[PDB]
Amino acid sequence: TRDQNGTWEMESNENFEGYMKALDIDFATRKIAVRLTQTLVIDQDGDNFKTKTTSTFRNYDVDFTVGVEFDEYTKSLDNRHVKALVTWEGDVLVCVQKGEKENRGWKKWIEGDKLYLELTCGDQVCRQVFKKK
Numbered sequence: 001t002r003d004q005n006g007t008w009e010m011e012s013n014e015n016f017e018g019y020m021k022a023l024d025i026d027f028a029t030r031k032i033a034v035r036l037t038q039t040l041v042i043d044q045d046g047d048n049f050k051t052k053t054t055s056t057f058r059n060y061d062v063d064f065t066v067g068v069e070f071d072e073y074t075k076s077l078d079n080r081h082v083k084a085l086v087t088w089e090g091d092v093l094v095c096v097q098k099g100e101k102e103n104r105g106w107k108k109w110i111e112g113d114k115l116y117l118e119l120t121c122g123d124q125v126c127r128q129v130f131k132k133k
């Protein structure tokens with residue numbers, strides 16, 4: 001399925017520390033962030049996505065249209081400018097964030113009632129799994 005609508009509660013989070021370190025997120029922020037349960041709310045209408053990731057400590061909102069390049073300033077993360085593009089490869093939603101960091105982006109897909117999110121930066125891969133609330 002390409003339908004990723006839902007309120008998604010984080011079930012697991014593998015190597016978030018490595019990914020954040022590759023992004024140059026400071027030590028203290030990384031230590032807080034690795035322990036937190038995230039909720040990812042996705043509102044998807046055709047090719048329009050509105051997403052909100054929340055935790056007790058920090059939130060991050062990003063909206064995008066599939067197939068439309070957009071400028072991103074990663075405020076509240078690593079505070080960089082990237083040129084972002086989100087597209088479909090089969091039923092995998094693929095984001096490439098072009099800029100200073102190599103191999104920067106993510107892949108998101110559904111597999112039997114779980115949402116999988118693989119975040120990449122440099123040589124690091126973070127693997128997250130969510131379940132619908």
Ligand SMILES: *C/C=C(C)/C=C/C=C(C)/C=C/C1=C(C)CCCC1(C)C
Pocket residue numbers: 020025033038051053055058059060061062076077108117
């Ligand atoms: C569709 C999947 C998306 C938009 C993935 C979003 C991932 C985040 C918003 C993660 C954000 C964070 C970090 C990268 C490190 C600091 C903690 C967070 C949760 C603000």
